[PDB]
């Protein structure tokens, strides 16, 4: 009488985004892309950025 398949239990993954290691290499490479001199606009505005 008991129900054979009641529902489908949602199962969680064991990798979220910290792996996949050039999505993860991209997190890093691009986070460090911001603070390297970005030469597109005049140079005098780019020595005065903390």
């Amino acid at each position: 009488n008991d129900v054979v398949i009641p529902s489908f239990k949602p199962v969680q993954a064991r990798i979220q985004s910290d792996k996949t290691p050039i999505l993860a290499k991209a997190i890093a490479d691009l986070a460090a892309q911001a603070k390297q001199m970005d030469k597109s606009k005049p140079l005098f505005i780019e020595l005065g950025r903390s």
Binding site: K39, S40, K41, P42, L43, E46
Partner: protein, 159 residues
Amino acid sequence: IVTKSIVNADAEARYLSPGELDRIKSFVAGGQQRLRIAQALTDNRERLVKQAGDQLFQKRPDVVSPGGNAYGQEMTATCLRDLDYYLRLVTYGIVAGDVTPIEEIGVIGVREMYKSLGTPIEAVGEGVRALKNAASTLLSAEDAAEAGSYFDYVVGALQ
């Protein structure tokens, strides 16, 4: 860069290389930015030439000394016209990508010329270096690297 690639593949018996076609493609892609740099240098002709010439006379007062060549209003006007000519050739070289317009209009026989005119070569070169510094201060940063490296060719080729 098309003329130089064509004559280089002309010296050999073969066609244009895939590498050279990549060079032409990258030159086309950067050509619009080079036209922007030419736009800025065309519109800043006056003050760039005057600031560079006055920086030259600050560095080298021998030319405007009365024993020097650029003594007097007319002689110093021709001095500023020479700096104008060289800035014009620098804009041509920035647009073309070659230095063959700079070379065959203003580099190739300039030593014998300025020897026969009595004019020192090194002061011309210092004035073009002052032009390089002024146009480097006017433009965007790596854009100024682009402009100042053609200026650097003119400076190294004059000496």
